[PDB]
Each structure stands twice: as C-alpha cells, then as structure tokens.
Structure 1
Amino acid sequence: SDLRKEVENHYKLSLPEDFYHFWKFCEELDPEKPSDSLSASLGLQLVGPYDILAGKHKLNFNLHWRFYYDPPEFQTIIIGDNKTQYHMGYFRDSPDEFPVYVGINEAKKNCIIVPNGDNVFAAVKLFLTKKLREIDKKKINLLKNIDEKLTEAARELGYSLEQRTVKMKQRDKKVVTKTFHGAGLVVPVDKNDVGYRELPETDADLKRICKTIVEAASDEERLKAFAPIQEMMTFVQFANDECDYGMGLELGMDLFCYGSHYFHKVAGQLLPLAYNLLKRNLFAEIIEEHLANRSQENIDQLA
C-alpha cells in the first residue's frame, strides 16, 4: 500500500485495480524487468505511473510522458514506436474518479484518441490481436502464448476485453460533444439543460477557421482571422456566467487539439478556467503546465 501511495501521490490521481494487476501480470512474464516484458514481442513498454512501480524515479509528473496532443484527461501508461509516437493512456473525465477507459493516440499522426477497452488488459489484448492478424511464424507462437496468459488473467480478474464495452456505450449517452480528439467531453447537465451549450460553428467549419489563422501571411491578417475565435470567446464568457461551463471546455479543447502554438494563449484563457469552474482543478494545473512547455520530443521527466 505504501508503493501505491507513492504512485498515486506523485500524479495526484488514483489508479484502478487493473493497473496494479497488469503490473503483476508483467512481473510473471519477466520478474527482472516487468516494464519491458512486452517490448520484444509487441514493441510496447510500460511507463508513466509504471515508471514509479519499476523504481525508475529514485520532477513534474503532470508532464511525464505527456505527448503533444494528450489532454489533461489522458494519462500515458504504455508507449510504442516513436516513429508514430503510439501510446496508450487512461482517460478520466474527472480527477476524482477512476478512468472511464483506455485511449490510444499516435501523436505524430493526429490528435485522435481511439478508445481501446475499459482497462489495460483489454487495450493490450486488442493490440496483440491486431498484431496477430497482421504478421512470421516465430513471432506468432510467442504472441499466442502471451495472448493465452493475458486472456486467462483477465477472465480470473473479471476484466472485459472488448474494444467498446457496454459500460463505454453508456458513457456515450452522457457525452455532450466529441471535440476534435473524439474521446468525448462529459460535464454535468441538469434537468433544465444547464451545464453545456454548443459552439456556433460545426467542427468542420471551426477547423477551417483555425486553418486560416495558421496560414495567415501577417500579424495584421492573423488578427483579422482570429475574429471568429474572439466572438466565440465572448459567447463562452456568457456561458460561464450562466453556468454552461462545457462550452468553454469544448472550444479550448478543440483549439488545443488543432495543435498550433497560435492558439496557446486563448487555450490558456479557456481551459484552466473551464476546469476550475467544473471543480476539476488538477486538470487546470496540468493544462497550464503543458501549454507552458508543450514539447514534441523529450517528454520523459526521468531521462
């Protein structure tokens, strides 16, 4: 329990039981280097809060293995090839609740968060099954052995292995908007529909607006191209005054997701405030620190 406290106090996030059970699974695979037990067969390595379990931390965990498009909800636990910057993370709607599922993102490809089961056994199972369906006879036998052991453990522990579980499908009903990442945003909406209001542009049209800002040819033209964004920020101010905090979280998230440093200032105006109004204060802290140092490479706080 002491080790658990260390892991969870460093991130100020509770970790679900599958996190700890999966460490033990990887310890059975390789007692000497559990974090690397899937490296040879799958190209995956356990990191993040697993670095603490591994003793590699013996310093801001808010930025540790936080890739360029990882929103504060997303906490990296597994990394793959740095050519695509494939990685898996727990996704939490609230810092005070357990992860709602495991998402994957390829940070050199896009900002999309792909849901991959609701626990890390599922996410690794799905990765393995895809790899098995692609490939080398020598690799297959090894993969099939890991698949058997992984599947047996999940069955003993009661963990679903589906990419989209019934639980995940129920969360879809509470998502108020997908955002650019596609993971979805969940905020309280009361019986009077207070809590969220939509943006006045479609996602497609918002991306066009962002494109014209990024491609502006001068400061003068960029200022003019920013007018639709400033207009939406005024709407967000009234939404905040009126307790529809989800609007500013959506606009700020989309601008973060678009990826341009030209949006860092307004994203820093939208997202900390939105998270603080939503009483998700840790996420306000993460996004502030990430916007201040949004690195594309060298995000390992222990290197």
Structure 2
Amino acid sequence: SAIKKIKEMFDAVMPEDFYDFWAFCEELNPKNPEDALMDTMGLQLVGPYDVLTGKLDSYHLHWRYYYDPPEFMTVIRGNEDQGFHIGYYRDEPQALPVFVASNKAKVSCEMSVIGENLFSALNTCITENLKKQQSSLKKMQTSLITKAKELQYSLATTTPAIKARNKKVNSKTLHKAGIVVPVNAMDVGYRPLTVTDAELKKMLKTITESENKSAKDKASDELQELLTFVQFANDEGDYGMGLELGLDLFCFGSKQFHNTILQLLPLAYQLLGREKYAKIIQEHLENRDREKLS
C-alpha cells in the first residue's frame, strides 16, 4: 500500500521480502513493528521502513553510514559501537537488490553477504546471538523458519543466484561486495587496476599517514598515474575501472580523497546509466560524518 510512498520519498522499489519482513514483525510487535527485534537482538528497522513507522513524512542519506556505497541502502540498525547495520545491495538503481549485506561501519568498510532477503539476514543474526532471553529468541527462530518456509524465502547465506552473480563481478573491491558492469563482445566495459588491492592500500596509507615526504610524493604520483589510466579507460569505454578506483578510495575512508572520488564516481555512474548513484555519492560526501538518524 505504501509502495507508492516509498517510490516517491526514496527513488526505489523494494523487493517483496521487504514488505513480508515488516508483516512478520507486526505479528511479533503490532504496536512498534520496527522494534520487534530489539528486546532480543538489539536491532531496529530504519531507512525505507521508517516511512511505514511514520517517523518520516532526498532521503538518500537516511541511516547511510560512513562506508555505505551508493548501492547499499540500510534497513536495519544494530550495535552502535560497531556501527552494525544491514542493508540491500543493488548493483543497478533500476534493478531489485541482489543480496542483503551487513557492515560494521566503525570497524571496517567490508560487507558481509547474509542472503538474498531479510529473512535469511535475520536468520544469521539469530544464530549468532544464540551462539554467544535465549528461551524467547529460540521461539522467534522457529517462527522465522516456518514463515520463510511458507513464503519460500531461502534462508541460505549464499544462494545459487548470489553465486551466479559472483561470476559476473568485475572486481570484489575493498568492500568485497563486488561491482557488476557490462562487458561487450570485444571485452569493452572494464579493465583492472594496475595495482593489487594490497598494493593500493599500502599506497593510500602512505599518502595519508606519512612523514617521509618523498615517499608521500612518490605514492601521490602512483595514485596520479592510476587516475591517468582511469582517464584512458573512460576514453576507451572501460568505465568499470573508474568505478572500482572511486569505490576503493571511498572504502579507504580518508576524507582527503573525497575530491578525487568526486572526479571518479559521479562520472562513472553517469557513463554506466546509474545516474541516481551519482546523486547519492555527492550528497553522501557533502557531509559524511554526522548524526545518521535522518
């Protein structure tokens, strides 16, 4: 019913597990469906779910944490010291999400895939809370499993479709969740970075944490050489390279690179027909550390 709401407030269509998960949490907590997971695992529905709860009346930045790339849209918040949260990852603004992933934003840029849908996502969290109160949690585990059975949502952490998409990933990136861009019959559309990911981090750490000066100038020159390679790539149609490098600089997290990122990712997303993600990366870096709550 609020499909139309979310379509105009956010620029997105949510998959059916989004709505089915909500309804699962009404059953649990009719008063506050967004808080049904709180007493047992410290998790609260946020982002697109907030429109249903009433708290919302661009919204690209609503609960976007520090390392959420434009493809990531948060829908559940957890441990605040970790920055633990759960979102839908979406290679293409116009497509549905390809999986659900978690991030501990205060720990790392890295994304953990916990299934195709929020039922499998929650299923993973329930396993861990139970691994390390519990009598009440086991009975939620049971209702989740049967409800997911009914609606035939896989509870698998990696599904055949997730594995199928991983064979189309051009690069895992620093976040390890992968980019997917077209490649035509002449192999145009993507080319790799000329450094490994480990060399890339060593380079960027030198640029940002170093006193040697010549080493910083050297690494700054390597990075400038990368930007020139990206330049040839874009001229030659291999737009995935700039996307990879931009996302990688975003993932490193140094606010020093926001300007380079803004040379890479807005251009990359427009060249790829992913214009909405050019919007989000600009809005996000405009003010990246803040109160996330709206």
Length-normalised TM-score, structure 2:
0.97
- Listed one character per residue, the Cα deviations across residues 255-295 of structure 1 (whole Å, up to 9, x for unaligned) are 00000011111001000000000000000000011111111
- Determine if the alignment matches structure 1 residue 298 to structure 2 residue 261: no
User: What is the aligned partner in structure 2 of residue 112 from structure 1?
Assistant: 110
Match of 2:274? 280
Counterpart CA distance in 2 for 1:223 and 1:275 is: 30
Residue 298 of structure 1 aligns to which amino acid in structure 2?
E
Fraction of identical pairs, as percent: 51
- Is it true that 1:192 corresponds to 2:186 in the alignment? yes
Q: Any idea what SS the aligned residue of 2:101 has?
A: strand
Question: Which residue of 2 is the match for residue 75 of structure 1?
Answer: 73
Aligned-partner residue type, residue 183 of structure 1 = A
- Give 1:300's aligned amino acid: L
Q: 1:215 aligns with which of 209, 213, 232?
A: 209
- Per chain length, whose mean CA-contact separation is higher, i.e. which structure has more relative contact order (CA < 8 Å, sep 6+)? 1
Number of aligned positions between the proteins: 294
Contact 1:216 1:225 in 2 (8 A): no
Equivalent residue for 2:128, pick from 127, 130, 142: 130
Alignment of 1:55-70 (within 5 A): 55-58=54-57, 60-70=58-68
Equivalent position of 1:202 in the other structure? 196
Runs of 4+ with >4 A deviation = 218-224
Q: Are 1:164 and 2:155 matched, yes or no?
A: no
SS at match of 2:195: coil
**1:235-260 per-position Cα deviation (integer Å, ceiling 9, x unaligned):** 11111111100000000010000000
Residues 1:255 and 2:255 aligned together: no
Deviations 1:114-153 (A, max 9, x none): 001000010001110121122xxxx221111111111111
In structure 2, the residue matched to 1:27 is 26
Q: Tell me, in whole angstroms, the C-alpha distance in 1 between the residues paired with 2:44 and 2:134.
A: 19
Q: TM-score, normalised by structure 1?
A: 0.94
1:8 corresponds to 2:7:
yes
SS of the aligned residue for 1:77 comes to: strand
Contact kept? 2:206, 2:215, Cα under 8 Å? no
